[model samples]
Structures are given as structure tokens and as C-alpha cells.
Target chain A: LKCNKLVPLFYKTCPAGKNLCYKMFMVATPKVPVKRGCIDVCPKSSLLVKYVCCNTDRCN
Target chain B: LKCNKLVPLFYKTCPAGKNLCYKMFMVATPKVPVKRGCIDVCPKSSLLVKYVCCNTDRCN
Candidate 1:
């Protein structure tokens, strides 16, 4: 039962002909634990994390 | 050619029958110049920019 780990609050997508890829969006909190489902389901070992500020009115 | 000027290193896609939509990702510099073409072609004035770090090895 040792599948890949899944990270909470993370959105993942498996592109055609590609391995399972995950992208992390803007979150104020620190590291999120990886889930076993993600590892097993995902064909690829690469993870993408994207950081974004919510405030659109104020340009950062 | 007073069409929307093109923003550098930015990738944009206009959905079918929808207004021009643009998304900016993983730019190191601040305030990349916006294109006049974008302003003209885009039916909606709204713009989306998502900030992402290039360093995948180091968890920010």
C-alpha cells in the first residue's frame, strides 16, 4: 500500500503523453505534506510550485 | 500597427469567442511592460499575473 504521496491544497494535472505533474499555488503557509496517492498516481516525479500574491489592486 | 503591443516572455491565450486573456508566470523582474495590442484586442480589461519561482530544488 506504499503509493505516491499527495500534497494538500495542490492542483495536479496529467498532460497527454506525459507523466503526472502537480503545481502548487500561492499559499501563506509553509511546506505541505506530500500524499501517497500523488506518488502512485503520478507517472512523473516532477512537481511544480507556483507562488502568487492575491492582492490584485495593489501592485507588488 | 497600433494593435496591442506584445509583452516579452509572457504567454497568452484567447479562448474561443471570448475576450483576449493573458497569464504571466515566473517572471524575476518587476512590472514587465504591457503591450498596446493586448489592450486593444482584449475585450475585457482584466489581466492575470501569477508569480512563480524558478528554483525547483529549493522549497521557498
Candidate 2:
């Protein structure tokens, strides 16, 4: 993910909604190394995201 | 899984916010076999859910 300059560390780490929100910016597989942002619990298979909305973490 | 009186054979089979909203009502493991509700991509992790929330499918 080329995260378009959002601020701070966002949160939804399992309270209230209890988790499932996810985001990423990793080149998983092929000499893989990853840890992007806003990821909750979706482990790949959305065909690699480009934009995700803000249900929180402020902007959309 | 004891589904309440919420109707429709619901779906979130990916689009818009495109997957990750999850809910379930399964006795997943112990004598396993399950297919409960409101799930898209969340599997076996939020410590086997009992209730999750809605960004869609109309209810919370």
C-alpha cells in the first residue's frame, strides 16, 4: 500500500467491533518481507489492495 | 450456531469495502462442521466469534 500520508497509529485492535478490519502493504511471497498498515485480521486474498476506506483512523 | 430471526441468506461476497466484516455462530471444533453468518474472509481466529458487528447487511 502506498498509504497516502495518514497520521498516527490507527486502532481497532479488538474492542467494540472485535476485529476483522484489515489493510496491508506487503510484497508477500517471492523473497517476502511485509508490515504495512491498518491490518486487523485479513490474511491476503483480496488481490492486493490499492485503497481502503476509513471506518475510523479519520479520513476517507 | 443459533441464528436469530434475521432473514435472508445474507451475503458480503466482496465489493465496496470488499471483505473483512465478519460474524459467526458456529461450534467450530469439538465435533466440527459449520456455516453460520455474515462472514467474508474471517476464519478461525478472533477466538471463534459469538457476535461481530455490521458496516453493512443492514444490522448490528
Candidate 3:
């Protein structure tokens, strides 16, 4: 898996039981940066935020 | 949701889109403090690190 948040994106292997790529973003807050990484599980969407999850390596 | 890392524990309303209570811990490095907060998504465990994510008000 890999993570790309801000500045210098990097690749990383998920530990033990983690097998999903996760991404989060929001425009409500001005200049909110996109958040991306690997996670074990994905959280549900709320208010003005959005979440994206994938199972393939680096799929986020 | 609430977060309890070190020192004082406090409650907080997750940012729009962040509904999961996240906690992280690692004993590999001596005296590593526990990390708790509201995260849109939890990162995958890495090396000797562990991550916990829940959808309750203060589950972490």
C-alpha cells in the first residue's frame, strides 16, 4: 500500500492485518488537503467530508 | 468523540467527515505514548505499531 497526503508522497507496506487504501477530503474548510494512506478499515462519511477506500495495493 | 493520549483526556467533535475514534500504540520503542484522536480513516499497522478505529462517540 501507499499514502499520499501532502509533500513528498511515499509508499509503504501495510502491517499485519491491514489491507485497504484509504482517502479522505473536504472542501468545507478552505484549503483542506487531501488525505491518503493505507488502513485496516474505513470510516463512514459524515457532514461535509468524504471518504474513499480500496482493497488493491496503492489503489487509493 | 473523545481522545485520550497522555496527560489530560478531552472530548471533541470530529471534523466534518471524520466519525471514527482512532487510537494507536506501540511498545517496541520504550515509553512510546498512546495516540488517540478523531480521524477520517485509520492507517494500517506498521512494523511493531498497532492501530484501532471505531465508530462510537468515544470508543477509542
Candidate 4:
């Protein structure tokens, strides 16, 4: 999707074996930027942030 | 909590920086064994399995 650290804006295709796409958002700042990528493991949601994971193509 | 890998029956206290307790269960076989422990990150729920996370002591 379109989010990250170094580049901050880019597109990425999920690599083989890592089928889950995730997006992380800050709870306090709902409009703030987000981090998105393909990950094998999905982390638990926290008090300050939310983690959403999807299995379909470009579902995130 | 009461679950795990190597030993399969033991207890573990959460370490510093990792405050979450997580338990994973197979959706098809809810009565089957489980994996429990402290984790810094929590993963997403899937079609065949479910992941539950908690913040309090021994909450898993």
C-alpha cells in the first residue's frame, strides 16, 4: 500500500509466503499517517493504536 | 499462563517491555492445546485460528 518509514509514500506487493497485509494507525490522532505493509505475523491491538490485518489481495 | 512450546506445560512471567499476554486457539478444535505467553506484538486473527490478547496479569 502507500505508507512507511524511509520513503513515507510508496506501493508494495506482498512477498511470497507473507499473505497478510496490515495497517497500523494511531488512536489519538485518527487523521495521522499510517504504516502499511505485508507481514507474516499480525500483532495485537493496544490502548494507543490499532492493527488491522487482511488476507485478500490489496484488502488493506 | 498455562501453555507453551518446548515443555508444553509450564508458567512464564512477562518480561520488561512486553506487557501483553496472548493465547492462540484452533477454531476447528477449540478443545485442543494452546500456546500462551508474553508478547511485545500481537498478531491478526485468521479464518482457521483465533488470537486473544490481554493486558492484566495472567489475563490470557
DockQ of candidate 1, scored on C-alphas against the true complex (2 decimals): 0.02
Where does model 2 sit among the CAPRI classes? Answer: incorrect
Ranked candidates (DockQ, high to low): 3, 4, 2, 1
Poorest stretch of ten by lDDT in candidate 2 chain A: A26-35
> Which of the two, 3 or 4, has more DockQ?
3
- Against the true structure, what is model 2's DockQ? 0.03
Instruction: Give the top-scoring candidate (TM-score).
Output: 4
Off by over 4 Å in 3: A1-8, A27-33, B1-60
For every prediction, compared with the true complex, DockQ reads 0.02, 0.03, 0.05, 0.04
Tens digits of per-residue lDDT, candidate 3, B10-50, equal: 66665667778776555343244355667776877644456
Assess candidate 1 and give its lDDT. Answer: 0.28
Clashing pairs in 3: none
Can you write out model 1's per-residue Cα lDDT over A1-60, one digit (the tens) per residue?
A: 112224333343432443433323323222442221222243222123232222122111
Q: How many backbone overlaps does candidate 4 show? A: 5
How do all the candidates rank in terms of lDDT, highest first? 3, 4, 2, 1
Over the stretch B1-60, how does candidate 2's per-residue lDDT look in tens digits?
222222235543434443334333322332221223344444433332233544444332
| Candidate 3 accuracy as TM-score | 0.42
Model 2 RMSD, rounded to 1 decimal: 15.6
Candidate 1: regions farther than 4 A off: A1-19, A22-60, B1-16, B33-60
The best-first sequence of candidates by TM-score reads 4, 3, 1, 2
